[PDB]
């Protein structure tokens, strides 16, 4: 179906009272006064502004923030050097050079994520088969140099150790959907 937005059905003819009403609308600026009243009501409403650094904006457990490498409860790193997160990374922001460790486990030696190249899409964390790489809730990690956003494995493991008390709770609240 369809409807008209500006077409009128027939006409209301010409009448003295309707003419006086239109004349008063033109001369007395009635729609302008109406708009004044609308923004006056908005003046007397309560603003939606939050006090920013003390009241943060609401979020969700699915939120994609700063990347982190997680660990098992034993303390062993979850990552098993399988590289499919960098295979699925649409920006080619991950570099996963790897070799067998001293105990023979399959681990990484270089895990770099270029945060200036990353598009923050979560494909790595939804591709990871062991929940090693995650995108935790940190978003206030702006830096004063370009180099500080070129993360390596030490930086990512430090972020994982820093945010594990929140990342684990979010994954607990979220994993039944994914």
């Amino acid at each position: 179906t369809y409807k008209y937005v500006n077409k009128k059905e027939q006409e209301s003819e010409v009448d003295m009272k309707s003419a006086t009403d239109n004349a008063a609308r033109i001369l007395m600026w009635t729609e302008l006064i109406r708009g004044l009243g609308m923004t006056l009501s908005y003046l007397f409403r309560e603003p939606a502004t939050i006090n920013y650094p003390f009241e943060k904006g609401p979020l969700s457990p699915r939120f994609r923030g700063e990347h982190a490498l997680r660990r098992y409860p034993s303390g062993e790193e979850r990552c098993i050097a399988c590289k499919l997160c960098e295979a699925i990374c649409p920006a080619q922001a991950i570099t996963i050079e790897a070799e067998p460790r001293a105990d023979g486990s399959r681990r990484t030696t270089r895990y770099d994520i270029d945060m200036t190249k990353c598009i923050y899409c979560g494909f790595c964390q939804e591709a990871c088969p062991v929940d090693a790489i995650v995108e935790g809730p940190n978003f206030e990690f702006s830096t004063e140099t370009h180099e500080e956003l070129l993360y390596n494995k030490e930086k990512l493991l430090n972020n994982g150790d820093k945010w594990e008390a929140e990342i684990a709770a979010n994954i607990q609240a979220d994993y039944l959907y994914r």
Binding site: T39, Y42, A48, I88, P90, I119, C121, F123
Partner: protein, 103 residues
């Protein structure tokens, strides 16, 4: 002040999206469509998804289709809010911009 000719030079946001898409896989090329029209992200995603679904000869489940329509109309409200309020901002009024941007 009268305009005799308009010549819009574009390409100052041309980033070779089609070439990058042909260099990446389908799931990798999906979030480019979020950035084509960055006011109707779910709508562009739906367009690309329906194209790939038609090529794959598969159909999404009915719950997925209803969610896609719901977020399609959500994108439509977002885009028409943006269009109307920024049009009014270019005309000269900014209070509808602030109200509908809270929404």
């Amino acid at each position: 002040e009268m305009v005799r000719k308009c010549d819009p030079h574009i390409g100052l946001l041309h980033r070779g999206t089609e070439k990058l898409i042909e260099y990446k896989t389908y799931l990798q090329a999906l979030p480019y469509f979020d950035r084509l029209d960055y006011v109707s992200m779910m709508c562009n995603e739906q367009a690309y998804s329906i194209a790939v679904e038609k090529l794959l000869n598969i159909q999404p489940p009915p719950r997925a289709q209803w969610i896609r329509v719901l977020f399609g109309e959500i994108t439509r409200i977002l885009n028409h809010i943006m269009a109307v309020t920024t049009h009014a901002l270019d005309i000269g009024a900014m209070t509808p911009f602030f109200w509908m941007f809270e929404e």
